[PDB]
Amino acid sequence: MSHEQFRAALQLVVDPGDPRSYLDNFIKIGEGSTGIVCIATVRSSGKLVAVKKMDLRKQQRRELLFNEVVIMRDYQHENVVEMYNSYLVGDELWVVMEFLEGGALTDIVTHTRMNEEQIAAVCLAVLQALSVLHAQGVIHRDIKSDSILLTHDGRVKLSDFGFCAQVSKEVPRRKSLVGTPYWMAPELISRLPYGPEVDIWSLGIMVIEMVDGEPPYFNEPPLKAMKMIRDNLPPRLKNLHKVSPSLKGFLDRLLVRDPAQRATAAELLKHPFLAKAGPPASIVPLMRQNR
Numbered sequence: 001m002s003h004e005q006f007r008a009a010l011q012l013v014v015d016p017g018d019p020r021s022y023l024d025n026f027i028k029i030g031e032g033s034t035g036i037v038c039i040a041t042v043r044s045s046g047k048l049v050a051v052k053k054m055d056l057r058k059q060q061r062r063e064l065l066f067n068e069v070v071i072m073r074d075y076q077h078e079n080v081v082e083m084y085n086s087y088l089v090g091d092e093l094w095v096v097m098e099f100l101e102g103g104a105l106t107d108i109v110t111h112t113r114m115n116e117e118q119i120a121a122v123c124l125a126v127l128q129a130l131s132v133l134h135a136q137g138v139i140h141r142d143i144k145s146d147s148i149l150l151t152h153d154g155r156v157k158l159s160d161f162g163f164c165a166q167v168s169k170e171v172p173r174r175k176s177l178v179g180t181p182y183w184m185a186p187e188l189i190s191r192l193p194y195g196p197e198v199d200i201w202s203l204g205i206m207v208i209e210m211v212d213g214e215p216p217y218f219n220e221p222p223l224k225a226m227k228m229i230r231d232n233l234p235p236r237l238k239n240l241h242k243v244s245p246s247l248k249g250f251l252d253r254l255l256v257r258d259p260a261q262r263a264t265a266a267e268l269l270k271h272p273f274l275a276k277a278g279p280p281a282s283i284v285p286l287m288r289q290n291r
């Protein structure tokens with residue numbers, strides 16, 4: 001019942017029909033909470049796309065499925081993984097996207113230690129994405145290294161908008177417990193009204209990732225972890241002594257408990273740390289095929 005209503009409504013926001021006629025050779029690449037990710041060929045062009053497949057009867061918060069397919073429709077940015085189409089397919093939602101051949105930043109922060117020139121390249125990239133999105137009131141809400149995908153030549157693109165959100169002059173804030181626990185902003189966990197700032201904190205956690213190789217409290221269970229994010233002063237770097245005051249000073253602007261005081265993406269684009277940012281050819285050596 002609530003399923004057919006939900007189904008009918010989603011129909012209206014995706015593209016009509018069935019993409020199986022023109023997509024061949026599904027190759028699974030990833031699994032997530034919402035479902036699996038594949039690559040495919042478009043028969044007419046030879047081109048590769050990535051297809052996210054989300055089972056309608058298998059979500060937590062089913063109605064989250066409305067967000068990306070509307071908010072990101074025809075969204076065009078060089079640091080954003082473009083979304084081509086969505087469709088309803090069986091009891092499944094498929095989102096068809098740009099293929100990013102280099103994999104996620106996760107592989108890199110787990111297997112090596114990025115220099116500051118590379119960390120600023122990633123940070124510029126993501127903030128150039130975040131400022132354009134925030135200036136239209138779009139909130140990513142799942143910023144972490146998994147959402148950072150790469151091209152063969154080391155260009156960085158923000159991805160994974162499944163948890164995203166739209167705010168307006170008339171609903172300027174959200175209140176929903178979404179994200180990935182160890183990355184979640186203090187206020188978010190707290191259950192308070194929040195804006196795009198929750199993304200800046202999150203990016204701070206990602207910087208800890210690129211420096212330390214893991215976020216704070218990664219060992220402690222998610223439930224208890226979350227608690228400590230709300231209750232405690234911002235987390236510091238294990239490898240503090242490994243980082244410049246430029247980098248630390250830059251981090252000190254993202255990990256601010258009070259979101260009012262926390263820098264915005266627009267503010268952060270002017271920060272001196274970002275003068276360090278390497279060309280996208282400084283990232284190439286970090287990638288798996290090139291190690």
Ligand SMILES: COc1nc(NCCc2c[nH]c3ccccc23)nc(Nc2ccc3[nH]ncc3c2)n1
Nearest residue numbers: 029030031032037050098099100101102103104159
């Ligand atoms: C939440 O779980 C999850 N896992 C993965 N796997 C990332 C692996 C990946 C990303 N690019 C790759 C190229 C070759 C081999 C692996 C990769 N990818 C995604 N999402 C995703 C979204 C857009 C994408 N565009 N291109 C790949 C891609 C993956 N989600």
